[PDB]
Amino acid sequence: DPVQLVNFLQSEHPQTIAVVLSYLDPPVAAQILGALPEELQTEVLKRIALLERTSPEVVKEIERNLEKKISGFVSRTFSKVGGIDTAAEIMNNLDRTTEKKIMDKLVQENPELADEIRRRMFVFEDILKLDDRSIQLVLREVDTRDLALALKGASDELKEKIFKNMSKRAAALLKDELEYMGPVRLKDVEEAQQKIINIIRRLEEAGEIVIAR
């Protein structure tokens, strides 16, 4: 059912439809053209054909911004390459014997790098490997809004590890807000989780807690 497309275009003038249809894959562009009112059809195609001779000023402006946005992505992504994030992602994907060997050597040789990589490897579910005191320390820094949102994207064992580390009442209160907030978007769960991730990272940066490995 493409139809919502047809109504969008139905009430436009031929040159605007020609401009709109030209940024599509031609089979899609044809399906839409075929469904447009019969009286508009021939003239839309004529305008599509003659579009590189008329050449609207809007087309160049669309390219001038398409160009800049793709350019900037390329510059932000590839001007510097590698780094601590890359290193962390690689270690998370290595076989356990290899990553223990690499981490073991870095604890001897360059201990602060090992720590940087350790912090950067941490991912939300790694809270399960934190000890109770560490979790308790993390909780007195995170607010209940941020925590509840973050757990809406969590497994039971994770939720349980949190519940065991708060007062018997505040656990029951937390369980309640999780039941009654409902619809939340992935984006909001991610940054809530990331807010917590940074707190865990800052606390280990200060030597307040240990991240297991």
Q: Which two tokens stand for residue 118?
A: 């350790």
Interacting stretch for Ca ion, rule CB under 5 A, among 50-58, 93-101, 117-125, 200-208? Answer: 200-208
Least distance (Å) from Ca ion to the CB of residue 136?
A: 20
Q: Which two tokens stand for residue 175?
A: 């369980």
Binding characters for Ca ion, 62-81, by CB under 5 A (x = yes): ------------------x-
Interacting stretch for Ca ion, rule CB under 5 A, among 27-35, 36-44, 129-137, 197-205? Answer: 197-205
Interacting stretch for Ca ion, rule CB under 5 A, among 99-107, 134-142, 152-160, 201-209? Answer: 201-209
Q: CA–CA separation, 115 vs 87, rounded Å?
A: 12
Site for Ca ion in 78-117 (CB under 5 A): 80
Closest CA to 199 of 92, 117, 124, 114: 124
Q: What residues have CB less than 8 Å from 99, skipping those under 6 apart? A: 91
Q: Which two tokens stand for residue 194?
A: 């990331």
- When the beta carbons of 125 and 205 are compared against Ca ion, the nearer one is 205
Task: State whether the Cα torsion 211-195-91-113 is positive or negative.
Answer: negative
Angle 156-163/168-179 helices, nearest 10 degrees?
A: 140
- When the beta carbons of 67 and 205 are compared against Ca ion, the nearer one is 205
Amino acid type, 130: L
- When the beta carbons of 40 and 210 are compared against Ca ion, the nearer one is 210
Q: Report the phi/psi class of residue 94: left, alpha or beta, with left for phi > 0 and alpha for psi in -120 to 50.
A: beta
Least distance (Å) from Ca ion to the CB of residue 205?
A: 5
Q: What residues have CB less than 8 Å from 196, skipping those under 6 apart? A: 124, 127, 138, 142, 146, 147, 150
Least distance (Å) from Ca ion to the CB of residue 75?
A: 11
Least distance (Å) from Ca ion to the CB of residue 187?
A: 22
- When the beta carbons of 53 and 80 are compared against Ca ion, the nearer one is 80
- When the beta carbons of 104 and 205 are compared against Ca ion, the nearer one is 205
Least distance (Å) from Ca ion to the CB of residue 202?
A: 10
Residues that bind Ca ion (CB under 5 A): 80, 205
